[PDB]
Design a protein around this ligand. Sequence first.
Ligand SMILES: *[C@@H]1C(=O)C(O)=C(C)C(=O)[C@H]1O
Ligand SMILES: [Ca+2]
Ligand SMILES: [Ca+2]
Length: 419
Amino acid sequence: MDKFRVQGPTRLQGEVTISGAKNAALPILFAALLAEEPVEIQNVPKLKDIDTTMKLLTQLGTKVERXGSVWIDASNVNNFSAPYDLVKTMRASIWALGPLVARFGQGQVSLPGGCAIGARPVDLHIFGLEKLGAEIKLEEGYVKASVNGRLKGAHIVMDKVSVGATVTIMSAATLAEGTTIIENAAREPEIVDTANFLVALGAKISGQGTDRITIEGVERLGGGVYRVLPDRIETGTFLVAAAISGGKIVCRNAQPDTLDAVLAKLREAGADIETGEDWISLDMHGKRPKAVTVRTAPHPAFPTDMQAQFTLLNLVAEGTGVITETIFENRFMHVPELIRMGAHAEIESNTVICHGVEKLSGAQVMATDLRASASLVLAGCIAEGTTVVDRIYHIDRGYERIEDKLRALGANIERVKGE
Ligand SMILES: *[C@@H]1C(=O)C(O)=C(C)C(=O)[C@H]1O
Ligand SMILES: [Ca+2]
Ligand SMILES: [Ca+2]
């Protein structure tokens, strides 16, 4: 398993160019199955799931090629089944179901786990398509959807916010007969970006970004060009890299409005921040950060995806801070590892009490969550000595060339292969 051997302490500063959000590129790529004409999706990161999605689409009869853009021609999509071998590594493959049934009246996606009484993440997608008039069933290892003719617009009330089901319902709704209204819709910028992509193809959607999205079905969608938005978590991750090392940095190709709560919190930590249309700068002016208090909640509130990074910030800040998770109350895998690096923190239920220390010490660490893993790399950058972060493939799957980006900021880092 590959590892990153990092040597500190180092000050992280300079510039970084933010990649597009894999979490917006993915739903957009499947939404492209609706387009009857060629489409160009710009600013698509080069990550495993993107390649996995490209192969899946190709297997459906889509002409697919990529570079920084991914070009799609779904004009001749003629196979409506996504097989086990092509979906096995990716849960998001369920997003092919909605577009397929909406445009072709049929679709089937290989699903692990067979039949079950207990509620599963997949069901939300299923209930959404059922509300839209599709008949669904699980058989011979597949979830199979069909509808005679067109789907039918409906007033949907979501019991709990779900990014995945919102995408499925909104995407499929664009070709439904009549109007669809999604109450308590997911508000994430990724939903906004996906809605905007559908619109650039000719769909009628309003409300994206609020708790209610309204869609007006249309006969068909055309083609076009759309640029995926910047990855806000990668952005926050680099902002934190400078914030914790007394550095200064500028993130190019960013989008400030997707990070309101994160910026406000970085200012509370003592960061001098400026922003423009598509860039963000942060300057610590050589100072240690001030501990802050954080509460994760649904977007636009503070994101759980920035929680490990901010935990790290508090752990090297002046003062005591409290991190509270209301989205995933058990996502604190990084704490014990940062404690082995010299930190001081108590985990109390769904919160972490942090007592910032002066300097961390290198150690061998590891976390299986992408964000926590990136946080351990950042900690290694500022810790005294050598740190070895193991199982970095989690990072490789969600961050584009994080190694190069950090090296350009002054990091002393190396990938170690083999054993
Ligand atoms: C059980 C099953 O066999 C089936 O066809 C459906 C619709 C399910 O949700 C499974 O849990
Ligand atoms: Ca079931
Ligand atoms: Ca069945």
